[PDB]
Each structure stands twice: as C-alpha cells, then as structure tokens.
C-alpha cells in the first residue's frame, strides 16, 4: 500500500510525461517540406489502404506529428532519416518498405503511448480502486512501450550511421533497401503490431471496470 501510493504516482507521471511532451511538439509545427519529407515520401504514400489524400496532407497533421514525437522530435535526428529514406522511396519496390516503417513501427508505437496515457488520465482519481496486479501491469506496460520506442530510436540512429559510414549505401538504392529491411523484417512488424494491439487492449480491460 506504501507500495501501492508510489506505483500510481509512478504511472500518473509516466501518463502526465507522454501528454505534456505531445502538446509541447504539437506546437512546434513543422516546416512547409514536413522536415524534408514532404517531396519524395509523405507526398507518394498513404497512411492506410483506406486513405485518399497523401500523408503530407492537412489531413494528417496529427499523425506526422506523432511520427516526429516518436523519433523524441529531434529535428536533426527526423531531417537526416528523412533523406536516406527519400532515396528508397523514390523507389515505387521500395516504398512500401518506408510506409511500414514509418507508420507500422514509429507511429504505431508513439500512438500507443498517447492512446494509452488517454485513457489512463481519463480515470485518474479511480486507480486507487484497483488490485496491485493491475497497477503493476500497466506500470510494466509503459515499460515495454519504452523499450519498443527505444529500439526504434537505436535502428534508426544505426541506420544514419551505416549511411553515412558506407559510400555503397549511398549510390546503390538495392544495398540501401536490405539495410533498412534487415532491421524490419516482415515477423518484426507483426510481432511489434501484436503487441502494441495486446498493450492497448489490456489497458482497456485493466480500466473497464474503474469507467
């Protein structure tokens, strides 16, 4: 119970972090070329099979911005990606591979924080009524979020690295396509969106019976 009162404390913090940070960047708006994006990528993609605009629409101001929030919007960090992966997808074989990643990974994992610390505030007065079972998973939920965000962040440093360390990755678009996929194979992205959906799920269950 000591115990108890830190553990929320704990994940109201983690809840209250992940909603300050996205107003904060939310307000940092974006350039018109979307951080140098907008012509070669969000421009020729979609967000989802079932979209009609392009991702570089008003439309989808929200989604680039959790996209940013997800690489911890350092523009420096967004910008040099950015360029790298203009080159794949300036490939039509190899844009779908940048869509995945982009979307699939990144902003599927900065979605689920968000959604996730939603919901968690939305019942904040009512966490003392649950079970420390419960407390504990969504404490350890936050944690493997944390961890799915913070690989995301490792491969695409490591991919600016490889880039920039490797002419070839420069001047042979193929070589750059296997580079970016032996870090997003195609059980990777299935397991990150199972787990993500079973995070999600979860929390509502968890908070069923506190609405």
Do not use: C
């Given at each position: 119970?000591?115990?108890?009162?830190?553990?929320?404390?704990?994940?109201?913090?983690?809840?209250?972090?992940?909603?300050?940070?996205?107003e904060?960047?939310?307000?940092?708006?974006?350039?018109?070329?979307?951080?140098?994006?907008?012509?070669?990528?969000?421009?020729?993609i979609f967000?989802?099979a079932?979209?009609?605009?392009h991702?570089?629409?008003?439309?989808?101001?929200?989604?680039?911005?959790?996209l940013?929030?997800?690489?911890?919007?350092n523009?420096?960090?967004?910008?040099?990606?950015?360029?790298?992966?203009?080159?794949?997808?300036?490939?039509?074989?190899?844009?779908?591979?940048?869509?995945?990643?982009?979307?699939n990974?990144?902003?599927s994992?900065?979605?689920?924080?968000?959604?996730?610390?939603?919901?968690?505030?939305?019942?904040?007065?009512?966490?003392?009524?649950?079970?420390?079972?419960?407390?504990?998973?969504l404490?350890?939920?936050?944690?493997?979020?944390?961890?799915?965000?913070?690989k995301?962040?490792?491969?695409?440093?490591?991919?600016?690295?490889?880039?920039?360390?490797?002419?070839?990755?420069?001047?042979?678009?193929?070589?750059?396509?296997?580079?970016?996929?032996?870090?997003?194979?195609r059980?990777?992205?299935?397991?990150?969106?199972?787990?993500?959906?079973?995070?999600?799920?979860?929390?509502?269950?968890?908070?069923?019976?506190?609405?």
């Amino acid at each position: 119970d000591p115990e108890v009162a830190k553990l929320i404390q704990k994940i109201l913090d983690r809840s209250e972090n992940i909603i300050q940070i996205s107003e904060m960047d939310s307000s940092r708006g974006e350039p018109n070329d979307q951080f140098g994006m907008r012509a070669e990528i969000f421009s020729k993609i979609f967000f989802n099979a079932n979209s009609t605009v392009h991702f570089d629409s008003h439309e989808y101001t929200e989604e680039r911005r959790m996209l940013y929030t997800s690489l911890n919007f350092n523009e420096g960090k967004i910008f040099n990606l950015g360029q790298i992966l203009s080159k794949l997808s300036q490939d039509s074989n190899y844009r779908g591979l940048v869509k995945e990643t982009l979307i699939n990974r990144g902003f599927s994992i900065q979605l689920a924080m968000e959604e996730i610390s939603a919901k968690i505030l939305n019942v904040k007065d009512k966490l003392q009524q649950l079970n420390k079972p419960n407390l504990e998973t969504l404490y350890n939920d936050f944690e493997k979020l944390t961890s799915l965000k913070e690989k995301w962040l490792k491969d695409t440093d490591d991919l600016i690295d490889e880039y920039n360390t490797n002419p070839d990755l420069q001047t042979d678009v193929s070589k750059l396509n296997d580079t970016l996929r032996s870090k997003n194979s195609r059980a990777q992205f299935a397991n990150i969106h199972d787990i993500i959906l079973d995070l999600v799920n979860t929390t509502t269950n968890i908070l069923a019976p506190i609405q």
